Design a protein around this ligand. Structure first.
Ligand code: PRF
Ligand code: PRF
Ligand code: ZN
Ligand code: ZN
Lengths: 364, 364
């Protein structure tokens, strides 16, 4: 199988749909990656994650390097075997969570309490047996001074080269996995340009848009995507990290994004929030106490085929694990169905109408 | 289909194996009933409960009557449709949990804060659409004075008649469900005899042994079963409520018990305890951190087919829901496999050897 082969099947405006072929499977783009925090997509067996339509999941370097530990997972056969997901896994580099969850920053890297460097990040992702390795970056806090944004980005660009070289010098990794670079630059077009320039110069299999969804509202996120995604190599996937709500996803695909990860469907699922085509609902609301309809009237997921709002309402209010299970399965299924609808509509050259139709109904 | 038809296929000593045919399915005996507290077997989809081999599950009158409420569940189509379990459900009467979880006792019944009477218990079980209805009883605290034990039992026997009559006067219920009487009498052979006498006189589809596992160690529980189960009608099922550990189950079947319910496999599963043929293990123990073997080397369950001790160790220590899910599925599967082994061995007239072999290995 191919290491990493991205093919664009169809375009509409800035939107693209296609496939990333990897050794462990095909990723249909635009893709949503369920996040699997500590070697589990919370409340779901991998077979259920797969059943919802996920082609790839996200693993966290930061969390796994602490618990159970990267050497330990490698000893146990790698993350795929450990958690029983045999399809592609993208691992974040730790760059974001080390600052958000732990800290002393330096040129060599970051030292913390719960040294993570580009090299060590790559190595850990190696030990995990990640299929898509993220370069180790610094997710510039928002907002930030232009000079601040610029030296922050420039360090990440230096760390991107280091990541590239560390990755390349590990033959197994280089032959079997992919490496993505992460664009930073905050909300600054010139810094974003600079960063894309550096990344493209170094060369990556894919390019993420880092440092968004970190304080910027949707309007501002979209404005930054409007100029930032065109700076990335067209012929490589574009990954918007940590985004987002269904409408964030639709608008980002309209701006050229091919890949997404977000904790929202899993986390808000556990918290009672179900996504529906008519917008989110909070299943704990007393209005659902005797509602026999499924979470979503159109959803094809197993939850919606079998259980009512009323039942899931009861479960979540009772703090029952099955409630978290069913809410999560539905929300991830919903997200996957959204992605499918997105892919099909771009394929068919009716994505613009879809986005419009989606938005009308979702916000109504 | 039959309302309630119990057939004994094979005997060995006091042990029996056979089948209870009901409208919603066949129950193979000796049977273990997973407990489904608030309309869910914790951490398991009903399809998974079924996959483990459960033929019937237990529902709680007390919990459901408070949340979401019996009228409400009936309005929503009954407990089976609500929770998506279409096979038999045995509902406890509330007699035990009203005292243990809530209280003022009287002849008419019990009034509490979180009036439950025999009639109201039956009615609620009716609204739930229970297949096996338990008479409303009083689970005599242990230990207790003989006079105390005796008036407690005598009230339950009066409540048993009331339960019988309430059940019978509801034609739908009488035609489609079964009613079990509950023997009390504490640890007193004469009171147990009295109680069996009263129950048999009233007449039930099945007879439970109530008031055990409530302070009595195994030796004492077994001593009480030694004289109490022979007092029950042979031709009806014998249900030991709230029991128990695998070895409790084996010894109780050796004493004539046909049915069991216990929260142990689910609750201790969530708590890190896995049952294995070599005894329970606490998967949180550091010794399992790199153990690639399944929870149990012989277990046929899906968990043991796919995930290692090491992984489940990690999940449970991380407080991950999937950990609770996999631990529970395995433990319920284990219990079901135990019951199957019990049934097969009685069928084959090698149950005595099995019990011996089971015990040797389990306690070793
Ligand atoms: N939303 C921004 C973001 C999410 N995850 C991230 N991971 C990394 N390494 N860098 C980033 O900027 C981000
Ligand atoms: N272990 C005793 C027991 C468990 N569940 C019970 N439910 C009822 N109604 N009565 C009882 O005595 C018991
Ligand atoms: Zn659904
Ligand atoms: Zn197992």
């Amino acid at each position: 199988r191919p290491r990493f082969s991205f093919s664009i099947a169809a375009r509409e405006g800035k939107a693209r749909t296609g496939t990333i072929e990897m050794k462990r499977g095909v990723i249909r783009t635009p893709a949503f990656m369920p996040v699997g925090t500590a070697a589990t997509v919370k409340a779901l067996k991998p077979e259920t994650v797969r059943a919802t339509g996920a082609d790839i999941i996200l693993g966290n370097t930061y969390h796994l390097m602490l618990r159970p530990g990267a050497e330990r997972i490698a000893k146990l056969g790698g993350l795929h075997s450990f958690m029983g997901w045999d399809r592609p896994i993208l691992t974040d580099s730790g760059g974001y969570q080390v600052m958000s969850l732990s800290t002393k920053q330096s040129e060599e890297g970051v030292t913390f309490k719960s040294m993570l460097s580009p090299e060590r990040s790559i190595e850990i992702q190696h030990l995990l047996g990640s299929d898509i390795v993220m370069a180790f970056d610094e997710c510039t806090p928002y907002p930030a001074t232009p000079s601040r944004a610029a030296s922050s980005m420039e360090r990440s660009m230096r760390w991107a080269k280091r990541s590239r070289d560390a990755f390349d010098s590990r033959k197994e990794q280089a032959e079997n996995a992919a490496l993505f670079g992460i664009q930073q630059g905050s909300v600054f077009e010139n810094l974003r340009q600079q960063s894309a320039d550096a990344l493209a110069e170094i060369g990556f299999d894919g390019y993420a848009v880092g440092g968004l969804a970190v304080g910027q509202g949707q309007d501002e996120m979209f404005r930054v995507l409007d100029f930032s995604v065109p700076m990335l190599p067209d012929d490589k996937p574009h990954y918007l990290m940590g985004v987002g709500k269904p409408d964030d996803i639709v608008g980002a695909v309209e701006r050229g994004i091919d890949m997404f990860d977000c904790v929202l469907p899993t986390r808000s699922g556990r918290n009672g929030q179900a996504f529906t085509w008519d917008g989110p609902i909070n299943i704990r609301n007393a209005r659902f106490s005797e509602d026999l309809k499924p979470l979503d009237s159109e959803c094809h997921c197993a939850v919606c085929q079998k259980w009512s709002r009323a039942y899931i309402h009861h479960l979540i209010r009772a703090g029952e694990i099955l409630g978290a299970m069913l809410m999560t399965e539905h929300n991830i299924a919903f997200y996957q169905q959204l992605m499918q609808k997105i892919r099909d509509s771009i394929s068919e050259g009716r994505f613009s109408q879809f986005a419009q139709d989606f938005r009308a109904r979702y916000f109504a």
